[PDB]
Scaffold this motif. Structure first.
Motif, PDB file in Angstrom:
ATOM      1  N   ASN A 181      13.463  16.203   2.042  1.00 26.28           N
ATOM      2  CA  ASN A 181      12.082  16.052   1.609  1.00 26.28           C
ATOM      3  C   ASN A 181      11.534  14.637   1.768  1.00 26.28           C
ATOM      4  N   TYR A 182      12.323  13.755   2.377  1.00 26.32           N
ATOM      5  CA  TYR A 182      11.903  12.376   2.638  1.00 26.32           C
ATOM      6  C   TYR A 182      11.161  12.412   3.974  1.00 26.32           C
ATOM      7  N   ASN A 183      11.664  13.252   4.878  1.00 25.47           N
ATOM      8  CA  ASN A 183      11.132  13.434   6.231  1.00 25.47           C
ATOM      9  C   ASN A 183       9.606  13.534   6.364  1.00 25.47           C
TER      10      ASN A 183
ATOM     11  N   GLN B 175      23.350  14.972  -1.361  1.00 24.41           N
ATOM     12  CA  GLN B 175      22.084  15.425  -0.789  1.00 24.41           C
ATOM     13  C   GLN B 175      21.846  15.036   0.673  1.00 24.41           C
ATOM     14  N   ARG B 176      22.698  14.182   1.220  1.00 25.49           N
ATOM     15  CA  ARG B 176      22.491  13.727   2.582  1.00 25.49           C
ATOM     16  C   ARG B 176      23.802  13.630   3.345  1.00 25.49           C
ATOM     17  N   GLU B 177      24.759  14.487   3.004  1.00 25.60           N
ATOM     18  CA  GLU B 177      26.075  14.468   3.647  1.00 25.60           C
ATOM     19  C   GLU B 177      26.021  14.824   5.130  1.00 25.60           C
TER      20      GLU B 177
ATOM     21  N   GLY C 289      24.173   2.424   1.209  1.00 21.94           N
ATOM     22  CA  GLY C 289      23.525   3.263   0.216  1.00 21.94           C
ATOM     23  C   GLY C 289      24.578   3.990  -0.581  1.00 21.94           C
ATOM     24  N   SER C 290      24.162   4.829  -1.524  1.00 26.33           N
ATOM     25  CA  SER C 290      25.129   5.583  -2.322  1.00 26.33           C
ATOM     26  C   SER C 290      25.398   6.935  -1.673  1.00 26.33           C
ATOM     27  N   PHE C 291      26.175   7.773  -2.341  1.00 16.98           N
ATOM     28  CA  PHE C 291      26.495   9.081  -1.794  1.00 16.98           C
ATOM     29  C   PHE C 291      25.325  10.034  -1.997  1.00 16.98           C
ATOM     30  N   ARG C 292      24.409   9.644  -2.878  1.00 13.35           N
ATOM     31  CA  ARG C 292      23.237  10.447  -3.197  1.00 13.35           C
ATOM     32  C   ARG C 292      23.676  11.819  -3.644  1.00 13.35           C
ATOM     33  N   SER C 293      24.815  11.851  -4.328  1.00 13.44           N
ATOM     34  CA  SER C 293      25.375  13.094  -4.827  1.00 13.44           C
ATOM     35  C   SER C 293      25.264  14.217  -3.792  1.00 13.44           C
TER      36      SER C 293
ATOM     37  N   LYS D 115      29.770  -1.954  -2.805  1.00 15.10           N
ATOM     38  CA  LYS D 115      28.419  -2.424  -3.060  1.00 15.10           C
ATOM     39  C   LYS D 115      28.252  -3.936  -2.976  1.00 15.10           C
ATOM     40  N   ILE D 116      26.999  -4.363  -2.854  1.00 12.32           N
ATOM     41  CA  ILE D 116      26.630  -5.774  -2.815  1.00 12.32           C
ATOM     42  C   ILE D 116      25.266  -5.809  -3.484  1.00 12.32           C
ATOM     43  N   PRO D 117      24.798  -7.000  -3.883  1.00 12.70           N
ATOM     44  CA  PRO D 117      23.489  -7.100  -4.535  1.00 12.70           C
ATOM     45  C   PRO D 117      22.336  -6.694  -3.613  1.00 12.70           C
ATOM     46  N   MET D 118      21.339  -6.018  -4.177  1.00 13.35           N
ATOM     47  CA  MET D 118      20.193  -5.600  -3.384  1.00 13.35           C
ATOM     48  C   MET D 118      19.582  -6.765  -2.602  1.00 13.35           C
ATOM     49  N   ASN D 119      19.504  -7.939  -3.222  1.00 13.17           N
ATOM     50  CA  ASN D 119      18.918  -9.094  -2.548  1.00 13.17           C
ATOM     51  C   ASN D 119      19.810  -9.724  -1.471  1.00 13.17           C
TER      52      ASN D 119
ATOM     53  N   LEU E   3      12.564   1.974   1.366  1.00 14.55           N
ATOM     54  CA  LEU E   3      12.898   0.558   1.310  1.00 14.55           C
ATOM     55  C   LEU E   3      13.855   0.136   2.420  1.00 14.55           C
ATOM     56  N   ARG E   4      14.828   0.987   2.750  1.00 12.30           N
ATOM     57  CA  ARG E   4      15.782   0.653   3.807  1.00 12.30           C
ATOM     58  C   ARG E   4      15.097   0.475   5.166  1.00 12.30           C
ATOM     59  N   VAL E   5      13.899   1.036   5.323  1.00 12.32           N
ATOM     60  CA  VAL E   5      13.165   0.911   6.578  1.00 12.32           C
ATOM     61  C   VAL E   5      12.731  -0.542   6.769  1.00 12.32           C
ATOM     62  N   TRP E   6      12.317  -1.175   5.680  1.00 14.55           N
ATOM     63  CA  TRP E   6      11.881  -2.560   5.729  1.00 14.55           C
ATOM     64  C   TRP E   6      13.066  -3.522   5.729  1.00 14.55           C
ATOM     65  N   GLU E   7      14.132  -3.172   5.006  1.00 18.49           N
ATOM     66  CA  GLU E   7      15.331  -4.017   4.941  1.00 18.49           C
ATOM     67  C   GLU E   7      16.021  -4.043   6.295  1.00 18.49           C
ATOM     68  N   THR E   8      15.878  -2.946   7.035  1.00 19.10           N
ATOM     69  CA  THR E   8      16.476  -2.826   8.352  1.00 19.10           C
ATOM     70  C   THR E   8      15.560  -3.448   9.384  1.00 19.10           C
TER      71      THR E   8
HETATM   72  O1  LIG Z   1      25.484  -2.002  -1.461  1.00 17.88           O
HETATM   73  C1  LIG Z   1      24.291  -1.709  -1.460  1.00 17.88           C
HETATM   74  C2  LIG Z   1      23.699  -0.600  -0.778  1.00 17.88           C
HETATM   75  C3  LIG Z   1      22.404  -0.326  -0.958  1.00 17.88           C
HETATM   76  N1  LIG Z   1      21.596  -1.071  -1.784  1.00 17.88           N
HETATM   77  C4  LIG Z   1      20.178  -0.724  -1.997  1.00 17.88           C
HETATM   78  O2  LIG Z   1      20.076   0.675  -2.198  1.00 17.88           O
HETATM   79  C5  LIG Z   1      19.183   1.250  -1.207  1.00 17.88           C
HETATM   80  C6  LIG Z   1      19.705   2.598  -0.780  1.00 17.88           C
HETATM   81  O3  LIG Z   1      19.363   3.580  -1.746  1.00 17.88           O
HETATM   82  P1  LIG Z   1      19.896   5.073  -1.617  1.00 17.88           P
HETATM   83  O4  LIG Z   1      21.361   5.037  -1.368  1.00 17.88           O
HETATM   84  O5  LIG Z   1      19.364   5.841  -2.763  1.00 17.88           O
HETATM   85  O6  LIG Z   1      19.170   5.572  -0.294  1.00 17.88           O
HETATM   86  P2  LIG Z   1      17.682   6.103  -0.079  1.00 17.88           P
HETATM   87  O7  LIG Z   1      17.757   7.371  -0.849  1.00 17.88           O
HETATM   88  O8  LIG Z   1      16.869   5.011  -0.676  1.00 17.88           O
HETATM   89  O9  LIG Z   1      17.632   6.230   1.406  1.00 17.88           O
HETATM   90  C7  LIG Z   1      19.108   0.216  -0.100  1.00 17.88           C
HETATM   91  O10 LIG Z   1      17.876   0.354   0.596  1.00 17.88           O
HETATM   92  C8  LIG Z   1      19.211  -1.100  -0.870  1.00 17.88           C
HETATM   93  O11 LIG Z   1      17.982  -1.528  -1.428  1.00 17.88           O
HETATM   94  C9  LIG Z   1      22.099  -2.173  -2.458  1.00 17.88           C
HETATM   95  O12 LIG Z   1      21.421  -2.871  -3.182  1.00 17.88           O
HETATM   96  N2  LIG Z   1      23.428  -2.423  -2.249  1.00 17.88           N
END
Ligand SMILES: O=c1ccn([C@@H]2O[C@H](COP(=O)(O)OP(=O)(O)O)[C@@H](O)[C@H]2O)c(=O)[nH]1
Ligand SMILES: [Mg+2]
Length: 351
Positions: A260-262, A194-196, A188-192, A237-241, A268-273
């Motif tokens: 506030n996700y709690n 918000q989840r450090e 995932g990203s750093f989410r600026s 990073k890598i492609p979402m698919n 989506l990561r719940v299903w991808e995992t």
């Molecule tokens: O290299 C990566 C890492 C993550 N993702 C996608 O980005 C989502 C993560 O989004 P975010 O970091 O915003 O986390 P969330 O806030 O969704 O938990 C993952 O579920 C994937 O669908 C992606 O395509 N490539």
């Protein structure tokens, strides 16, 4: 009957970026759902029509994929601006897909009027007036209605597990057993920031072989409140698919979210995992009532418990497979409601 879907602040092209990817996936689920849809973006492409080559009124429904309306740097962003112009000239109700806690709908004009390139646009041109229907993937619509308090035209709020679209795709399939090379993984990203706190807790200083793929980078973790010494390996990073094949590389994959996700969002990561070859380890605070999977072994309350759960999976392949089998079976139970899900979506957009 014609539907138009566009991203509010990002260009849509291929699967290189996340906002582009989630938009094309949404395009695909709605088409596979038996509906005529078009993605409208900056230019014509494999999956899209150009903003200036179509008439917003040729459509009877307009779906907007949430995004940030912030003009980073001193430059105009056509993705945001063009999307708002398009929306601004649409007469009927707009359906706002709220999938990220920090991306509520909002007027872009306030952020433009004071910019130096403001002379290129008029208020009337960017001021979105149509009524807005916010489709939130949060069970408790109250996080959505809270973020949208400052905006008037928002007349509706409705829940709908939007991100379940990963499992309802016609090409979807469960990950297969794969040669393990990691103990734990998170993408995932750093989410600026918000989840450090959660990221440091479950991915740093664990003593395990962990990987943090995605946009986040090590040097971003420097909040004094959440110290660490040994960080996980960042691989980019890598492609979402390609996300599920990636998670499948590890013994376990982490599920954490924003505050506030709690007990609200089942991301989506719940299903991808859950669909990968990686055992799903959820953070307790994320789903305290255990709505995802009714088996406390898939939940970890802190760093020590994660280390413990993983040392268990490493010692018993019998246990690792038993849990994989369980989560896969639960995922299949949600898939068997595909028809019910599609219908709920059609109702959401007043169809
Ligand atoms: O290299 C990566 C890492 C993550 N993702 C996608 O980005 C989502 C993560 O989004 P975010 O970091 O915003 O986390 P969330 O806030 O969704 O938990 C993952 O579920 C994937 O669908 C992606 O395509 N490539
Ligand atoms: Mg997300």
């Amino acid at each position: 009957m014609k539907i138009a879907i566009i991203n509010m602040g990002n260009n849509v092209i291929n699967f290189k970026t996340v906002p582009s990817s989630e938009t094309i996936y949404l395009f695909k689920v709605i088409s596979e759902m038996g509906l005529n849809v078009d993605i409208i973006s900056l230019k014509n492409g494999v999956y899209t029509k150009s903003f200036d080559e179509v008439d917003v009124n040729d459509y009877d429904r307009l779906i907007v994929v949430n995004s940030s309306i912030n003009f980073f740097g001193g430059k105009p962003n056509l993705a945001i601006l063009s999307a708002q112009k398009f929306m601004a000239k649409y007469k009927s109700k707009i359906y706002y897909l709220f999938t990220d806690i920090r991306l509520p709908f909002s007027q872009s004009w306030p952020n433009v009027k004071n910019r130096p390139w403001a002379y290129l646009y008029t208020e009337e041109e960017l001021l979105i007036k149509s009524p807005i229907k916010v489709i939130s993937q949060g069970i408790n619509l109250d996080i959505a209605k809270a973020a949208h308090k400052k905006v008037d035209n928002v007349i509706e709020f409705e829940y709908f597990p939007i991100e379940q679209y990963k499992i309802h795709m016609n090409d979807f399939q469960l990950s297969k057993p794969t040669k393990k090379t990691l103990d734990v993984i998170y993408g995932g990203s750093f989410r600026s920031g918000q989840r450090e706190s959660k990221m440091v807790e479950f991915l740093f200083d664990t003593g395990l072989n962990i990987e943090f793929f995605g946009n986040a980078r090590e040097k971003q973790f420097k909040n004094p409140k959440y110290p660490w010494t040994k960080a996980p390996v960042f691989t980019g990073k890598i492609p979402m698919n390609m996300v599920s094949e990636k998670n499948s590389q590890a013994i376990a994959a982490l599920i954490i979210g924003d505050k506030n996700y709690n007990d609200n969002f089942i991301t989506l990561r719940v299903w991808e995992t859950m669909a990968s070859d990686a055992v799903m380890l959820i953070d307790e605070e994320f789903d305290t009532k255990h709505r995802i999977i009714n088996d406390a072994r898939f939940y970890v309350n802190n760093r020590a418990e994660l280390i413990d759960r993983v040392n268990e999976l490493k010692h018993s392949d019998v246990l690792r497979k038993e849990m994989l089998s369980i989560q896969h079976d639960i995922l299949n139970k949600t898939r068997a409601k595909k028809a019910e899900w599609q219908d709920a979506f059609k109702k959401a957009i007043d169809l």
